[PDB]
Design an enzyme around this catalytic site. Structure first.
Site, PDB file in Angstrom:
ATOM      1  CD  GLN A  11      -3.259   0.991   1.782  1.00 13.82           C
ATOM      2  OE1 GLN A  11      -3.541  -0.081   2.320  1.00 13.82           O
ATOM      3  NE2 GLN A  11      -4.126   1.988   1.686  1.00 13.82           N
ATOM      4  CD  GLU A 174       3.679   0.520  12.774  1.00 14.73           C
ATOM      5  OE1 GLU A 174       4.205   1.122  13.739  1.00 14.73           O
ATOM      6  OE2 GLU A 174       2.980   1.107  11.917  1.00 14.73           O
ATOM      7  CG  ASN A 219       1.918   9.379  -0.160  1.00  7.92           C
ATOM      8  OD1 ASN A 219       0.712   9.218   0.000  1.00  7.92           O
ATOM      9  ND2 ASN A 219       2.809   8.519   0.286  1.00  7.92           N
ATOM     10  CD  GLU A 245      29.671  12.116  -9.515  1.00  5.57           C
ATOM     11  OE1 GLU A 245      29.671  13.051  -8.682  1.00  5.57           O
ATOM     12  OE2 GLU A 245      29.541  12.303 -10.747  1.00  5.57           O
TER      13      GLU A 245
HETATM   14  N1  LIG Z   1       3.963   7.930   4.488  1.00 11.07           N
HETATM   15  C1  LIG Z   1       2.990   7.038   4.190  1.00 11.07           C
HETATM   16  N2  LIG Z   1       2.840   5.949   4.980  1.00 11.07           N
HETATM   17  C2  LIG Z   1       1.891   5.023   4.717  1.00 11.07           C
HETATM   18  C3  LIG Z   1       1.011   5.206   3.563  1.00 11.07           C
HETATM   19  N3  LIG Z   1       0.180   4.161   3.549  1.00 11.07           N
HETATM   20  C4  LIG Z   1       0.504   3.369   4.606  1.00 11.07           C
HETATM   21  N4  LIG Z   1       1.502   3.911   5.315  1.00 11.07           N
HETATM   22  C5  LIG Z   1       2.190   3.354   6.492  1.00 11.07           C
HETATM   23  O1  LIG Z   1       2.607   2.024   6.196  1.00 11.07           O
HETATM   24  C6  LIG Z   1       2.442   1.190   7.340  1.00 11.07           C
HETATM   25  C7  LIG Z   1       1.396   0.132   7.052  1.00 11.07           C
HETATM   26  O2  LIG Z   1       1.886  -0.676   5.992  1.00 11.07           O
HETATM   27  P1  LIG Z   1       1.118  -0.861   4.599  1.00 11.07           P
HETATM   28  O3  LIG Z   1       1.994  -0.387   3.468  1.00 11.07           O
HETATM   29  O4  LIG Z   1      -0.293  -0.325   4.626  1.00 11.07           O
HETATM   30  O5  LIG Z   1       0.969  -2.453   4.600  1.00 11.07           O
HETATM   31  P2  LIG Z   1       1.324  -3.426   3.386  1.00 11.07           P
HETATM   32  O6  LIG Z   1       2.724  -3.210   2.882  1.00 11.07           O
HETATM   33  O7  LIG Z   1       0.253  -3.221   2.346  1.00 11.07           O
HETATM   34  O8  LIG Z   1       1.258  -4.874   4.055  1.00 11.07           O
HETATM   35  P3  LIG Z   1      -0.095  -5.713   4.254  1.00 11.07           P
HETATM   36  O9  LIG Z   1      -1.298  -4.848   3.979  1.00 11.07           O
HETATM   37  O10 LIG Z   1       0.034  -6.160   5.689  1.00 11.07           O
HETATM   38  O11 LIG Z   1      -0.011  -6.808   3.232  1.00 11.07           O
HETATM   39  C8  LIG Z   1       1.983   2.101   8.450  1.00 11.07           C
HETATM   40  O12 LIG Z   1       3.122   2.570   9.181  1.00 11.07           O
HETATM   41  C9  LIG Z   1       1.300   3.217   7.701  1.00 11.07           C
HETATM   42  O13 LIG Z   1       1.274   4.429   8.448  1.00 11.07           O
HETATM   43  C10 LIG Z   1       1.243   6.412   2.748  1.00 11.07           C
HETATM   44  O14 LIG Z   1       0.539   6.644   1.751  1.00 11.07           O
HETATM   45  N5  LIG Z   1       2.222   7.251   3.109  1.00 11.07           N
HETATM   46 MG   LIG Z   2      -1.680  -3.789   2.355  1.00 14.21          MG
END
Ligand SMILES: Nc1nc2c(ncn2[C@@H]2O[C@H](COP(=O)(O)OP(=O)(O)OP(=O)(O)O)[C@@H](O)[C@H]2O)c(=O)[nH]1
Ligand SMILES: [Mg+2]
Ligand SMILES: Nc1nc2c(ncn2[C@@H]2O[C@H](COP(=O)(O)CP(=O)(O)OP(=O)(O)O)[C@@H](O)[C@H]2O)c(=O)[nH]1
Ligand SMILES: Nc1nc2c(ncn2[C@@H]2O[C@H](COP(=O)(O)CP(=O)(O)OP(=O)(O)O)[C@@H](O)[C@H]2O)c(=O)[nH]1
Ligand SMILES: Nc1nc2c(ncn2[C@@H]2O[C@H](COP(=O)(O)OP(=O)(O)OP(=O)(O)O)[C@@H](O)[C@H]2O)c(=O)[nH]1
Ligand SMILES: [Mg+2]
Ligand SMILES: [Mg+2]
Ligand SMILES: [Mg+2]
Lengths: 430, 427, 430, 427
Positions: A11, A174, A219, A245
Site C-alpha cells: 500500500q 510493527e 507522499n 558517485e
Molecule cells: N507515508 C505514508 N505511509 C503510509 C502510507 N500508507 C501506509 N503507510 C504506512 O505504512 C504502514 C502500514 O503498511 P502498509 O503499506 O499499509 O501495509 P502493506 O505493505 O500493504 O502490508 P499488508 O497490507 O500487511 O499486506 C503504516 O506505518 C502506515 O502508516 C502512505 O501513503 N504514506
Molecule cells: Mg496492504
C-alpha cells in the site's frame, strides 16, 4: 540511456509511487495518457508514436490499492502487466509476505522486472518503495531484494522506507516486521533512506500551516526528495552527481548506508512572499532538527558525510559560502576522520510543483542527504519496543504458523544490536 | 476475490441476519429484487464479497438460513428483502429444539446438519477465493447454540485454513428470558473457544442500555437492537467492500487483536450514536467519534472496561478523515488512559480507514476491544450454571438426548480455565 | 547594513511598536502591504520584488493585542511568524512573566530573533519596548534580556520603558513589578529611556491643546523620539551620531545609563503659525521641566551629559549659539567633572508627520537625551510605594505561588537603594 | 483560548443563569436557535470563550444546568433561549432538597453530583484551554447552597490550578423568605471561604433598592433583579470577549483585588442606571459613570461602604473613552475619599477598558469593590444563626440527613474568624 527502474511494494509503496509518477509526468510534460505534446528516458520507455511508459513495477498481495490505479486518472500511463496483484494480503505478517503468500507472486514479478530491464541500455539501478511495518512491505520486499541481489549482483539498489514512528504507530505488530526486514535490508541494500510519518506531519503543520495533513500530503513531499535525487540524471547543471558517485561520497563503510534526507524550503504560498529564501538560509535550515524526515536529535549525534543537492537558480560560490558557515557552527559536529564531509550537487532546473499541492513555488531548493549517528536512536527505541513484546512471546505463534522459526527473531535482534554497536563505534573520536 | 460466506442459525441469528442483509444491500445499492440501482461504481466493484451474481442483472446473498423451526424461515421470506435470498439456501427442520443444546447439537441438529453442509460446500465452490465464514446466533437457546456450534465444528474440519467469525448474543441475568440459558451458554462457549478465530460478544442488556440511555428511545424493539448489531457487522468488513487510505480485512484485524490463540472474544462498539433531538448540538468530527467509542456506555457487552485492561483495540473509521488526526486521537487515548491498557503490548491500538461512509452519515466508527473485563460475563454465567448443576436441576432432559453429566463437568472446567487465562494476562 | 532589530513586548510594547512601524513606513514610503512604489534597510529586510519586511518581533503572552495586528491595516507588513502569542497572560505578575508562563514561549522567540539577526549583515543592536508594570512587560522582558545578553554578549541593547507614574497608576501591584524588572535592567541593558504617561498627558493637554489625550496620542509622540534616535542611521546630514557614539557620549559610568528624553517643538497646527520656532528657542525649550517625558524636577538635579539630536533645516553655527546660551543659564547646572556636556547631532531630514496626528509639521525639531540626577526622584517615590506594601507583605503570596522567593524582593529593593546612592554620589561637587 | 465553563445550581442560579445567557447571546449576535446573525467580526472572534461550535453554523453555551427539581429545568427549556442549551447538559433530580443544606450537600446532592461531574469533565475536555469556572446560585436554600458547594469542592479537587468564580445571592433579613436561611448560608459560606478564588456577593435587598430608588420601577420582578446581576456578570468577562485599550481577565482582576487569600468577597456595582423619564436630563460621560459607580446606593450588597474601608476596587469600563480622563477620575475619587481606602495599599484602584460597549449604551461601567464593610452582611447572618442554634431549633431535620451539631459549631467559628480577619485589615 541512464535508466532507473522503480519498484513500488504494498500500500505505502504504491501510494508514494503514485505521487512520484504524478510528479515525473509534470516534470517531463507527459500527460496522464502517456502522450507528450531526451532526458525523460531515464524514467520512461517510449513506444511507437506519442506514448511514454514508466520504467516501473507496482506490486501488492491484495488488489484494492492497485485497483484504484487501474480505474483511475493514470490508467493509460501504465500497461496492465506492470501492475501486479494477488488475491489475499500478508495481514501485517512478515512470514506471509516472505514465505506463505509471497512465494506465489515473486517469480512473476521478477520475470516482469527482467523484461523491463532488458529494454534499458544503461541501467543505473533500482528505486524500491515500501513500508517497514506491513507484512508485504516487509516480508515481500525482503524476499524480492534477495532475488534481485542474486540475479543482478552489482547493480545499485536504493530503498525509500516508511520507518515506524516512536509514538504515532498504526499497527501493533510493527516492531516485529521492522526488525525482520532490517536484517535483510542490511545485506542486500546499497543505500536506505528511512522516513518517519510523525516528522512529516509535524513539518506539514509547522512549516506548511496545514491543520490536518493526510497521507496524500506526506507522499507528495516524499516524491520531491526522490526527484531531487534523480534530477542529476534527468537534467543537467553546473555540478552533477550520479548514483554511484553519491554512494561513493555518502557511504563510508558498507553497513553504514542509512542517510537522513531533509528538504528545504517547505513553505506556504503566503508565508513564502515575506521570506527571503537565500542559498545560505536554506542550507542553514537543512541542518536544523525541526525540518528532519525522521524523529531524532542530530545535536546528540555526529555527521559523517552530507550530500547537498541544490536545484534551480544557484551558483557554486554561494554554496561554498554556506558550507563555510555550516563549518563554523559548533552545534553541528562532524567526526574527526572526515576533514571535509560535503558532496555538493547543483542542477539548473527549479523544483516544479504539483497543481493543488501544499508547497509554494520557489526559485531554489535543496535536498540534504546526511549520514549521522543520530539515526541509531530510532533503532534503539524500536529495539526496546520489540524486546517488551518478545519477553511475553506476544503474537509470535502467528508468525510460526506461517513457517517462521523463533530463532529467526533472535537472530534479527542480534543483527540490529550489532549494527547499533557499529554505529556507536564510528562515532567516537581518537 | 475474498468472498465471505454468511450463516444464520436459530431465531435470533436469523432476525439479526435479516437486518444485516437489509443494511448491506442498501449500502451496495441492491433493492428488494436483487437488482443494482446504486449511483457509484465503488458499490459494484467488490459486490462479489457478499453477493453471487445470477442471470439478468441480479445479485443474491451468499447466505445460508438454518433453523429447526420453519416459522422463522416463513417470517424471513415474508419480510422486506425476504425474496432476495436463494430458496435452496433455507435449510429448516420441522420440530424445533425446545431450548435444549443437546437436541440442537446431538439429535435433531445432527439429522439436519448434513443438508446445511451440502449447501455451504456448494456456496464455497461458487466463490473464487473464500476468505471465510460469519455465523450469527445466540448461545442461550437450543438451535443457534447447539446446532450452530455443531455446524461450526463441521465447517472448521473442512476449512481449517479459513477465518471463522461469530456474532454471538450472550444471555444476561438482567434480561434473563429462559431457565436453562446457563447450561446452553456454557456448553457452547467451550466449543467456541476451540473452533472460532474471532467472536463478537453481543449482549441484549447492553443493547437495551444503549437504546434507552444513548439513543433516548422510549420503547426499543428487538429490531432496533438488531440494527445496532448489523451496523457493527457492517463495520468490520467495510475494508473488504470499499477502497480506503489504510485497509484492514478480517485476517489483519485478528492478527493485530489476538496475541494468544484463546483470547479472541471481542467487546464491540459503534460510533456515533445520538438522539433525534440531541443531533443538532454536536460536532461531526474525529475527536468526538473517538471519545464516544472508548466510553464504557457504548460497548455492546455488559462489562465495565475499567474493571479490566485492554489487550488490544482495533478501530475502523469510515468517511473522509485526516490520518494525522486519527493517529493523535488514538495516541492521546492510550496515554491518558494508560492504566486501562496492558503495558507489555506497546501501541495497543490498531487503526483502519475506509473512504466510503455509511448512508446518512459523513463519518462513522467501529470499535473492537479485547478486554480482560469480558471475564465478568463468563463468571456470571458460570455462577448461574453452578447454581443449577449443584442440584442437577433440569439435567434429565439433556440426558434424555444422550448427554452425560461428565460433559457438563468438562464444559464448566473449560470455561473456568478460559476465565483464569484472561485473569492471568490482566494481572 | 547598519540594521536595528526591534522587539515589542506585552500590550504597551505592542501598541508603541504599532505607532513606530506606522511612522517608519511613512518615512521610507513603504505602503501597509510592504510595497514601495537605500537607508530603509536599517529597519526593513527586502524580499524578491516590491516587498519590505520590518526587522521586528512582537511578543505577548495573551493573543488579544497581537490579534488586532493580524486582523488590521498592517497585516501584510509583518509575516505571521514574527507575531508571537501564547494563550494566557502574566496577569500583572512578574513571576508568571519571568518563570511560570514565560519559560514556555522564550525559546521560540529567541529562535526567531536569531533567524532575524542572521539576515542582517551589520547589526547595530536591539530596541526593546515594554512596560515596567505589567507581568509580561516586566517578567518576560527581564528573562528575554538575560538570554539576549548571554547569546549576543557585546551587542548594544536599548530599552524604551513606560515607567509608572507618581499619581496616575492603573494597577495596584505596579511597584512590585517595577522594582523587580529594574534589578535585571541594571545588568543587562546598555541604555534605558524611562517615560511617564502622566507627563505625556500633561504635554498633550498643555502643548497640543488636546482636551482628552488617549494612548494613541502618547504612542505617536513616543515613536517620534525613537525616530530621532535612529534618523542618524536611516538618513545622513552634517553631523552624525551612531548608537555606540551616543553611548560613549551619554553614559559616564556603567550603571548610570538612564537618560531622559525630551522632544521639541510639540505644537498644534494653529498655535504653531504664530510661533517663530527658531533653533535657539527649541533648544531652550528642551531644558525646561514642563516639556519632560518623566515627572520630576531637573532644577533640583544636575546634568552630567546631554545629547542634542537636531533634524531638518538646521546649521551647526546656530546650534553652537544655542549651546552657549544654555551654558550661561544659572538654573541649568552641570556637574563640575564635565567641562563640556554636549554631544550634538544634526540630520537634514525634517520630521515627517503621521496623517491625522496631533503634532504640526515643522521645519526643524530636536530630541534631547540628558543624563540628570533628577530621575532618582522617581525611583525614590517608587521605592517608597514598594516599602509600604511590603511592610504588610500585601499580594506577596501570589508571587510566591508562581515560584518567586521573598528574598528576591529584598534583594531587588537593596539593588535599587544602592543605585539611588550611586546617583547621589555622582551629583556632589568636590 | 481561555474558555469559561458556566454552572447553574438550584432555582435562583438557573434563572439568573438564563438571564445571563440571554444577554450574552444578544451581545455576541446569537439568536434563540444558536445561529450567528451579528454584524461585526469582533462578535465572533472570541465566541469560543462561552460557546462551543456545533455542526451547521450553530453555537451552544458551555453551560451545565443543575437542580434537584425538574420543574426548574422545564421552565428553562420552555423559556426564550431555552432551546440553545445542550439537552445532555441538564442534570436534574426528581425529589428537591426542601431548603435543607444537608440534603443538597450530603444526601440527594451526593447521589446527583457524579453525573454533573461527568458532564463538566467532558465540557473541560472540549475546551482547548479552560481558564476556569463560574457558578451562579444562592446560599439560603438547599440545592444551590449544599449541592452547589459540594460541586465546587469536587471541581477544585480536579482543577486546583483553575480560576473558581461564584455569583452568590445572599439571604437578607429584610427580604427573608425562608426560616433556615441562616443555617444554609453559614454552612455554605464556610465552604466558599476555602474553595472559591472570587465570590460576588449579590443581595436581593440591594437589588430591590436599586430598582425602586434608582430605576424608579414601581413593580420590580425577579426578572428585573436578575437582569442587573446578568449585566454585572457580563461586565467582568468583557475583556476576555472583546478587544480593548487596557485589558484585564479574571486572573488579572483577582491578583489586583485579593491581597490575602481569604479576602475574595466582592461588592459588585454597575453603571449607568437611569429611569426612563430621567434619561434625557443626563450626561453620557466618564465622570458621571465614575460618580455613579462609587456611590453606596449603587452597590449590589446591603452594606454601607462608608462603614468600612476599601482594600481594593477594580473598575471595568466599556465604550470609546479617554484613558487620561479615566485615570484622573479614579485618582480624584481616592484623593477626595482618602478615609474610605486602606492607607497601606497605594493606588487602591485598578482600571480596565474594553472598546465594545454593551447594546443600547455608548458607555458603561462595572465596579468590583473589596470592602471591609462586607463584614456587616456576615455579622447579621451569624447573629441569626446564633438565635436559632442556641435553642437547637430545626436542627433535627439536618441531623436526620446525617449531620452532627459539631459541623454547625465549626462553620460558625469559621465565619466568625473570617469576620475578625476583615476587621483586622479594616483597622
Ligand atoms: N507515508 C505514508 N505511509 C503510509 C502510507 N500508507 C501506509 N503507510 C504506512 O505504512 C504502514 C502500514 O503498511 P502498509 O503499506 O499499509 O501495509 P502493506 O505493505 O500493504 O502490508 P499488508 O497490507 O500487511 O499486506 C503504516 O506505518 C502506515 O502508516 C502512505 O501513503 N504514506
Ligand atoms: Mg496492504
Ligand atoms: N438482540 C436480539 N436478541 C434476541 C432476538 N430474538 C431473540 N433474542 C434473544 O435470544 C434468546 C432466545 O434465543 P432464540 O429464539 O434464538 C433460541 P433458538 O430459536 O436459537 O433455538 P430454540 O431453542 O430451538 O428456540 C433470548 O435471550 C432472546 O431474548 C433478536 O432479534 N435480537
Ligand atoms: N435575585 C433573585 N433571587 C431569587 C430568584 N429566585 C429565588 N430567589 C431568592 O433565593 C432564595 C430562594 O432560593 P432557591 O429557590 O434558589 C433554593 P434552591 O431551589 O436552590 O434549593 P431548594 O431548597 O431545593 O429549593 C430566596 O431568597 C429567593 O427570594 C431570582 O430569580 N432572582
Ligand atoms: N504609554 C502607554 N502606556 C501603556 C499602553 N498600554 C498600556 N500602558 C501602560 O502599561 C502598564 C500596563 O502594562 P501592560 O503593557 O498593559 O501589561 P502587559 O505587559 O501586557 O502584562 P500583562 O498583561 O500583565 O501580561 C500601565 O502602566 C499602562 O498605563 C500604551 O499604549 N501606551
Ligand atoms: Mg427458535
Ligand atoms: Mg497584557
Ligand atoms: Mg428549588
Amino acid at each position: 540511456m541512464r535508466e532507473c527502474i522503480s519498484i513500488h511494494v504494498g500500500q505505502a509503496g504504491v501510494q508514494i509511487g503514485n505521487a512520484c509518477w504524478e510528479l515525473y509526468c509534470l516534470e517531463h510534460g507527459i500527460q496522464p495518457d502517456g502522450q507528450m505534446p531526451d532526458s525523460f528516458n531515464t524514467f520512461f520507455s517510449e513506444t511507437g508514436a506519442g506514448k511514454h511508459v514508466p520504467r516501473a513495477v507496482f506490486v501488492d498481495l491484495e488488489p484494492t490499492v492497485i485497483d484504484e490505479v487501474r480505474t483511475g486518472t493514470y490508467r493509460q500511463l501504465f500497461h496492465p502487466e506492470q501492475l501486479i496483484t494477488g488475491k489475499e494480503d500478508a495481514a501485517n505478517n512478515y512470514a506471509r509476505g516472505h514465505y506463505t503468500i509471497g512465494k506465489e507472486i515473486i517469480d512473476l514479478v521478477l520475470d516482469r522486472i527482467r523484461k523491463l530491464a532488458d529494454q534499458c541500455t544503461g541501467l543505473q539501478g533500482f528505486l524500491v518503495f515500501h513500508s517497514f511495518g506491513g507484512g508485504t512491505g516487509s516480508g515481500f520486499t525482503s524476499l524480492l531484494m534477495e532475488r534481485l541481489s542474486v540475479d543482478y549482483g552489482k547493480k545499485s539498489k536504493l530503498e525509500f522506507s516508511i520507518y515506524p514512528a516512536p509514538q504515532v504507530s498504526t499497527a501493533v505488530v510493527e516492531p516485529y516486521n521492522s526488525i525482520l526486514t532490517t536484517h535483510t535490508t542490511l545485506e542486500h541494500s546499497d543505500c536506505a533512506f528511512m522516513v518517519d510519518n510523525e516528522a512529516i506531519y509535524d513539518i506539514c503543520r509547522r512549516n506548511l500551516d496545514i491543520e490536518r495533513p493526510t497521507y496524500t500530503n506526506l507522499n507528495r513531499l516524499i516524491s520531491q526528495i526522490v526527484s531531487s535525487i534523480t534530477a542529476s540524471l534527468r537534467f543537467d547543471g553546473a555540478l552533477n552527481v550520479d548514483l554511484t558517485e553519491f554512494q561513493t561520497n555518502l557511504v563510508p563503510y558498507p553497513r553504514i548506508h542509512f542517510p537522513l534526507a531533509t528538504y528545504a524550503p517547505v513553505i506556504s504560498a503566503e508565508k513564502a512572499y515575506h521570506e527571503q529564501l537565500s542559498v545560505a538560509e536554506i542550507t542553514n535550515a537543512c541542518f536544523e532538527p525541526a525540518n528532519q524526515m525522521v524523529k531524532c536529535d542530530p545535536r546528540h549525534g555526529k555527521y559523517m558525510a552530507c550530500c547537498l543537492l541544490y536545484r534551480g537558480d544557484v551558483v557554486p560560490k554561494d554554496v561554498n559560502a554556506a558550507i563555510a558557515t555550516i563549518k563554523t557552527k559548533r552545534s553541528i559536529q562532524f567526526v574527526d576522520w572526515c576533514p571535509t564531509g560535503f558532496k555538493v550537487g547543483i542542477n539548473y532546473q527549479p523544483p516544479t510543483v504539483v497543481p493543488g499541492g501544499d508547497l509554494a513555488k520557489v526559485q531554489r531548493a535543496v535536498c540534504m542527504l546526511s549520514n549521522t549517528t543520530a539515526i541509531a536512536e530510532a533503532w534503539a527505541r524500536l529495539d526496546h519496543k520489540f524486546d517488551l513484546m518478545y519477553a511475553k512471546r506476544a503474537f509470535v505463534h502467528w508468525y510460526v504458523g506461517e513457517g517462521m522459526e523463533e530463532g529467526e527473531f533472535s537472530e534479527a535482534r542480534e543483527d540490529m544490536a550489532a549494527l547499533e554497536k557499529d554505529y556507536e563505534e564510528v562515532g567516537v573520536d581518537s | 476475490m475474498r468472498e465471505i460466506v454468511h450463516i444464520q442459525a436459530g431465531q435470533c441469528g436469523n432476525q439479526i441476519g435479516a437486518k444485516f442483509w437489509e443494511v448491506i444491500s442498501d449500502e451496495h445499492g441492491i433493492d428488494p429484487t436483487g437488482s443494482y440501482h446504486g449511483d457509484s461504481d465503488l458499490q459494484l466493484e467488490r459486490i462479489n464479497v457478499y453477493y453471487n451474481e445470477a442471470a439478468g442483472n441480479k445479485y443474491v446473498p451468499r447466505a445460508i438460513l438454518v433453523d429447526l423451526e420453519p416459522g422463522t424461515m416463513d417470517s424471513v421470506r415474508s419480510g422486506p428483502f425476504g425474496q432476495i435470498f436463494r430458496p435452496d439456501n433455507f435449510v429448516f427442520g420441522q420440530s424445533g429444539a425446545g431450548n435444549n443444546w443437546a437436541k440442537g447439537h446431538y439429535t435433531e441438529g445432527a439429522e439436519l446438519v448434513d443438508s446445511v453442509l451440502d449447501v455451504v460446500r456448494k456456496e464455497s465452490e461458487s466463490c473464487d477465493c473464500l476468505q471465510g465464514f460469519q455465523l450469527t446466533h445466540s448461545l442461550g437457546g437450543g438451535t443457534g447454540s447447539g446446532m450452530g456450534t455443531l455446524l461450526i465444528s463441521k465447517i472448521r474440519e473442512e476449512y481449517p485454513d479459513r477465518i471463522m467469525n461469530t456474532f454471538s448474543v450472550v444471555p444476561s441475568p438482567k434480561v434473563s428470558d429462559t431457565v436453562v440459558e446457563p447450561y446452553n451458554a456454557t456448553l457452547s462457549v467451550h466449543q467456541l473457544v476451540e473452533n472460532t478465530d474471532e467472536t463478537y460478544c453481543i449482549d441484549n442488556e447492553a443493547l437495551y442500555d444503549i437504546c434507552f440511555r444513548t439513543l433516548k428511545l422510549t420503547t426499543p424493539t428487538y429490531g432496533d437492537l438488531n440494527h445496532l448489531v448489523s451496523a457493527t457487522m457492517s463495520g468490520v468488513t467495510t475494508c473488504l467492500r470499499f477502497p480506503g487510505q489504510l485497509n484492514a480485512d478480517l485476517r489483519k484485524l485478528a492478527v493485530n487483536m489476538v496475541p494468544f490463540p484463546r483470547l479472541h472474544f471481542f467487546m464491540p462498539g459503534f460510533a456515533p450514536l445520538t438522539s433525534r433531538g440531541s443531533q443538532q448540538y454536536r460536532a461531526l468530527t474525529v475527536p468526538e467519534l473517538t471519545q464516544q467509542m472508548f466510553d464504557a456506555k457504548n460497548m455492546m457487552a455488559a462489562c465495565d472496561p475499567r474493571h479490566g485492561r485492554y489487550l488490544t483495540v482495533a478501530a475502523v473509521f469510515r468517511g473522509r478523515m485526516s490520518m494525522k488526526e486519527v493517529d493523535e486521537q488514538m495516541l492521546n487515548v492510550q496515554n491518558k488512559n494508560s492504566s486501562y491498557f496492558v503495558e507489555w503490548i506497546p501501541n495497543n491500538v490498531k487503526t483502519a480507514v475506509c473512504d466510503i461512509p455509511p448512508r446518512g452519515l459523513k463519518m462513522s466508527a467501529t470499535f473492537i476491544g479485547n478486554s480482560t473485563a469480558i471475564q465478568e460475563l463468563f463468571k456470571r454465567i458460570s455462577e448461574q450454571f453452578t447454581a443449577m448443576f449443584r442440584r442437577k436441576a433440569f439435567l434429565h432432559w439433556y440426558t434424555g438426548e444422550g448427554m452425560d453429566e461428565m460433559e457438563f463437568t468438562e464444559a464448566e472446567s473449560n470455561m473456568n480455565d478460559l476465565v483464569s487465562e484472561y485473569q492471568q494476562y490482566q494481572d
